[PDB]
Amino acid sequence: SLLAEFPTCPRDEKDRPRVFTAASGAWLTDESGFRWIDFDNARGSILLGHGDPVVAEAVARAATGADGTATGWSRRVDAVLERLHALCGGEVVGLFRSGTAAVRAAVLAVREATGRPLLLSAGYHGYDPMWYPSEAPLEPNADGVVDFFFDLGLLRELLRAPERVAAVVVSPDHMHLSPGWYRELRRLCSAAGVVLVADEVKVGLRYAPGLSTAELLAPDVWVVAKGMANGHAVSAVGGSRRLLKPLKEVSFTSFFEPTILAAADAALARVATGEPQRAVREAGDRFLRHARKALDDASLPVEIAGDGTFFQFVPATEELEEALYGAANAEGLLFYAGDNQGVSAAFDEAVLGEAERRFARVCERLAPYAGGEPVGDAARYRVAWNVMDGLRQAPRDREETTGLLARLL
Amino acid sequence: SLLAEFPTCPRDEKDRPRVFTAASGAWLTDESGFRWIDFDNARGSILLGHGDPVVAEAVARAATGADGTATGWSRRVDAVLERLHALCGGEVVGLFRSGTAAVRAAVLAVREATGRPLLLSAGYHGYDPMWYPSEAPLEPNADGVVDFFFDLGLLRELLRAPERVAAVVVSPDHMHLSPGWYRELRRLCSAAGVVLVADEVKVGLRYAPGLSTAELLAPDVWVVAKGMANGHAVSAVGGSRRLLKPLKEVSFTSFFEPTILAAADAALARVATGEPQRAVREAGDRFLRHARKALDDASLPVEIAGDGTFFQFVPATEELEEALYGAANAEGLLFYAGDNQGVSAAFDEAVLGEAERRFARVCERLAPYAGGEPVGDAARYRVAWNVMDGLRQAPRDREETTGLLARLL
Numbered sequence: 001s002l003l004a005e006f007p008t009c010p011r012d013e014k015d016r017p018r019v020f021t022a023a024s025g026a027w028l029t030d031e032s033g034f035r036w037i038d039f040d041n042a043r044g045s046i047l048l049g050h051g052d053p054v055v056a057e058a059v060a061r062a063a064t065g066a067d068g069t070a071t072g073w074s075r076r077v078d079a080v081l082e083r084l085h086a087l088c089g090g091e092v093v094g095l096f097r098s099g100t101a102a103v104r105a106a107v108l109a110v111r112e113a114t115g116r117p118l119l120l121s122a123g124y125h126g127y128d129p130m131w132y133p134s135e136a137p138l139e140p141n142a143d144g145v146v147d148f149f150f151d152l153g154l155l156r157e158l159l160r161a162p163e164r165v166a167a168v169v170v171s172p173d174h175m176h177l178s179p180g181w182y183r184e185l186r187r188l189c190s191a192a193g194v195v196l197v198a199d200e201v202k203v204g205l206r207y208a209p210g211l212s213t214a215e216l217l218a219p220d221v222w223v224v225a226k227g228m229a230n231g232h233a234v235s236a237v238g239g240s241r242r243l244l245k246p247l248k249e250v251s252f253t254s255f256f257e258p259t260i261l262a263a264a265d266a267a268l269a270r271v272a273t274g275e276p277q278r279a280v281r282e283a284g285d286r287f288l289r290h291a292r293k294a295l296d297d298a299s300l301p302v303e304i305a306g307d308g309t310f311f312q313f314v315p316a317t318e319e320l321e322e323a324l325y326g327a328a329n330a331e332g333l334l335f336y337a338g339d340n341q342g343v344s345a346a347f348d349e350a351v352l353g354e355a356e357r358r359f360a361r362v363c364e365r366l367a368p369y370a371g372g373e374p375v376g377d378a379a380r381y382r383v384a385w386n387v388m389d390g391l392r393q394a395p396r397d398r399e400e401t402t403g404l405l406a407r408l409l
Numbered sequence: 410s411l412l413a414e415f416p417t418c419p420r421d422e423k424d425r426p427r428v429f430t431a432a433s434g435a436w437l438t439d440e441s442g443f444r445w446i447d448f449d450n451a452r453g454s455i456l457l458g459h460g461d462p463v464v465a466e467a468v469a470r471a472a473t474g475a476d477g478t479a480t481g482w483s484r485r486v487d488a489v490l491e492r493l494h495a496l497c498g499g500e501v502v503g504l505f506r507s508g509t510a511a512v513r514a515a516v517l518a519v520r521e522a523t524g525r526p527l528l529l530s531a532g533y534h535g536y537d538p539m540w541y542p543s544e545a546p547l548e549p550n551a552d553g554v555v556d557f558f559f560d561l562g563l564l565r566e567l568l569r570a571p572e573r574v575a576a577v578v579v580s581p582d583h584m585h586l587s588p589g590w591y592r593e594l595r596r597l598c599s600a601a602g603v604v605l606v607a608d609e610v611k612v613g614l615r616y617a618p619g620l621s622t623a624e625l626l627a628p629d630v631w632v633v634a635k636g637m638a639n640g641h642a643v644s645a646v647g648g649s650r651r652l653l654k655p656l657k658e659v660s661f662t663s664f665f666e667p668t669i670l671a672a673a674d675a676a677l678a679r680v681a682t683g684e685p686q687r688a689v690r691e692a693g694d695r696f697l698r699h700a701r702k703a704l705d706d707a708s709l710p711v712e713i714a715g716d717g718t719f720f721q722f723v724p725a726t727e728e729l730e731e732a733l734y735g736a737a738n739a740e741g742l743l744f745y746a747g748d749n750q751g752v753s754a755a756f757d758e759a760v761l762g763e764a765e766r767r768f769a770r771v772c773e774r775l776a777p778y779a780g781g782e783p784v785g786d787a788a789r790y791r792v793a794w795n796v797m798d799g800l801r802q803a804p805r806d807r808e809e810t811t812g813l814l815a816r817l818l
């Protein structure tokens with residue numbers, strides 16, 4: 001309890017952080033010697049696998065000073081910038097030290113460039129107080145942000161006075177929003193004359209070499225991070241020269257640190273091939289097939305949203321959800337509790353076989369829950385809110401919307 | 410110009426970033442093969458030396474998976490937190506990904522905890538737009554910050570309604586402010602009952618194992634960064650549980666990235682001994698003794714402020730300033746232009762001997778400037794503003810103070 005922060009991490013039944021000593025590909029070792037298969041993967045930022053040898057080699061060599069210095073420019077700066085520009089498009093690119101920092105800088109730049117005060121937001125954008133909730137729904141917070149919770153009806157309401165709106169800023173979820181949802185969001189923004197920022201810190205580079213919403217949203221400004229460096233401390237923003245001109249004022253001391261550049265250059269090279277993304281989808285799909293069959297065979301009322309790139313357990317009750325993760329912990333399957341599971345490209349045959357076996361045992365442990373009432377919508381909404389910080393897409397009217405917000409805020 | 414940002418770095422006569430392809434110790438190699446002795450050292454964040462072997466081996470181990478995982482807690486988290494707490498004091502500690510992020514989080518936490526609106530600031534606190542200049546000098550900016558430019562007369566007036574003030578936040582400079590100045594700041598903050606935040610991102614851990622202002626200011630909250638990881642992308646905040654309770658809300662995806670943790674634990678272990686800070690002070694003092702003697706023997710009107718830990722050339726004219734850095738550049742002495750020079754612990758007997766030879770040659774190249782009018786106060790004020798973003802300490806009244814603000818802002 002020296003730590004002033006509350007980091008999101010794997011925690012035990014007493015809410016104490018699990019202490020991990022080492023990791024390799026899909027596997028972790030804890031301080032008790034217990035061995036785990038990782039579906040958390042630093043919240044999906046470990047796309048390639050823990051201790052990736054090719055990234056590791058690049059990082060080790062950069063640490064010796066052999067690839068340039070934190071004092072100033074190296075050609076790896078140009079490499080990283082060019083790689084991102086090719087994958088994501090736009091006219092310019094900037095680099096940052098976290099997803100939180102990049103999305104804040106992006107949106108403040110757009111607010112400066114447009115001269116308009118309000119940001120309309122769906123999803124999570126990082127830890128900064130600028131994103132804290134307002135006094136009431138549909139009211140701006142103290143930093144001019146209004147949350148629309150992915151409800152396009154609420155967005156239309158807010159877009160009635162678009163002259164106030166610097167940008168719509170959206171964190172995609174491809175488990176809970178359809179392609180059609182995105183095209184409608186795009187349409188609404190375009191017709192309102194408002195800038196669209198795609199916060200792809202989580203989903204960027206993971207579904208494909210580039211932005212997951214490149215065509216669906218064709219955002220004016222993008223942000224990525226988790227996909228770009230196999231976990232290392234870098235994020236990126238890009239888009240029009242005009243909207244991002246205010247980023248000229250960004251400078252920070254560690255900008256040229258060569259280990260982070262080494263990791264991003266290495267990881268981005270593999271990302272560009274599309275191979276790790278395919279591997280993840282395929283491995284995760286294989287795991288899902290099996291897990292869905294095990295749950296059904298055991299009469300357990302747990303749906304799975306999403307797909308192999310990112311999936312989420314949707315249990316019929318809170319009690320079962322807790323039991324599910326307790327059983328998974330007991331069997332050494334480390335899931336990101338309540339949230340999305342994101343396998344890495346290190347999920348090979350060997351790993352998948354073991355994970356399949358362990359999950360069968362998870363389902364045995366849950367035998368007491370067999371035959372429970374099937375999953376209903378309240379559960380779907382609750383569980384989706386945990387991953388997206390807003391409302392999954394499904395038919396509603398305004399009164400149902402209000403009630404869901406009143407419940408879930 | 411893919412890059413949307415304008416990073417601070419060594420730049421050539423066309424303002425293009427210098428490309429450095431390698432580094433070891435005190436030495437850089439540029440793209441053309443030229444070897445430079447580095448006094449910039451990533452703005453003083455390279456306290457140990459480029460490619461420090463022990464840091465680099467630690468980073469190499471951590472890159473392989475064998476020393477923690479990005480998915481969660483590791484023993485290095487504890488080690489880093491404990492070491493910071495021992496060196497800097499306070500009740501709790503938080504980690505962040507840049508000095509910019511750390512200072513913003515710290516001052517926002519105090520504002521939240523105190524419930525008071527205004528932050529009274531002196532010095533640079535990073536790139537975030539919360540520190541942008543107010544439209545009217547000495548009035549609050551859009552984020553509630555009033556810059557007082559290190560003038561304690563102005564601070565007195567701003568403290569006349571202390572109930573409005575969340576914190577005074579100050580970036581120390583030990584070249585341009587005396588101990589007595591710090592003691593007066595502490596006395597003023599204490600009499601107003603206001604919280605004092607020491608932004609030691611640059612100076613922390615570099616003058617001593619701990620805070621440069623530990624006794625002088627006895628700050629309620631501290632921030633450090635440049636001293637803690639030999640360049641790697643981490644910073645820290647610490648202070649009272651109360652004031653920093655709002656940091657519970659901080660979480661970021663790369664928190665457990667093992668290479669940065671291993672670098673911090675290694676660098677901090679060295680810092681705790683006091684040895685690198687002593688080496689730096691002694692090596693720098695030896696270089697200054699020599700440079701001062703060379704400038705004087707050449708009748709060049711250049712003073713040097715500061716000491717071995719951080720020093721700054723103060724030329725009599727802007728023309729001579731530009732010539733001085735042109736000359737240094739030609740001799741492969743890489744100074745942080747206009748700002749403070751911070752040698753590293755890798756400045757050994759051989760480096761120093763070669764630096765002295767090169768600097769003597771610099772003075773030879775500046776021969777046309779011999780006999781020039783000696784440095785005056787307008788030059789001292791202009792040059793100090795470049796390094797501290799406010800006013801060097803000297804006797805003034807309010808006429809002279811406001812005159813200087815109008816000139817230098």
Ligand SMILES: Cc1ncc(COP(=O)(O)O)c(CNC[C@H]2O[C@H](O[C@H]3[C@@H](O)[C@H](O[C@@H]4[C@@H](O)[C@H](N)C[C@H](N)[C@H]4O[C@H]4O[C@H](CN)[C@@H](O)[C@H](O)[C@H]4N)O[C@@H]3CO)[C@H](N)[C@@H](O)[C@@H]2O)c1O
Pocket residue numbers: 006007008043044098099100101103123124125126127171172199200201202225339340385386387388389657658659660661662663
């Ligand atoms: C699109 C996007 N944009 C920007 C960023 C920021 O990038 P970064 O700075 O590099 O981390 C991210 C970073 N992503 C990390 C995670 O962000 C969310 O997770 C958030 C949030 O959803 C989740 O919120 C929790 C909520 O799900 C639970 N129902 C209730 C819990 N109290 C609450 O916890 C969080 O909010 C509390 C507010 N009081 C706070 O006290 C908690 O400590 C805080 N963790 O906590 C996470 C932050 O730590 C996503 N669910 C996840 O898929 C994702 O992996 C991102 O996904």
Ligand SMILES: Cc1ncc(COP(=O)(O)O)c(CNC[C@H]2O[C@H](O[C@H]3[C@@H](O)[C@H](O[C@@H]4[C@@H](O)[C@H](N)C[C@H](N)[C@H]4O[C@H]4O[C@H](CN)[C@@H](O)[C@H](O)[C@H]4N)O[C@@H]3CO)[C@H](N)[C@@H](O)[C@@H]2O)c1O
Pocket residue numbers: 248249250251252253254415416417452453507508509510512532533534535536580581608609610611634748749794795796797798
């Ligand atoms: C106490 C403290 N607190 C927090 C931080 C932030 O930590 P970080 O996020 O890890 O970098 C730092 C980081 N420190 C970096 C530097 O901060 C200052 O440097 C600033 C500022 O003084 C300096 O300002 C320049 C000024 O000295 C020149 N006379 C004029 C020039 N236009 C101006 O340029 C900079 O600020 C402009 C202000 N709008 C901006 O437009 C320019 O693009 C920017 N380069 O630019 C630097 C930004 O990188 C100090 N002089 C230096 O000793 C120090 O190394 C810190 O020292």
Ligand SMILES: [Cl-]
Pocket residue numbers: 559560561562802
């Ligand atoms: Cl003063």
Ligand SMILES: [Cl-]
Pocket residue numbers: 725726727787788789791
């Ligand atoms: Cl001058």
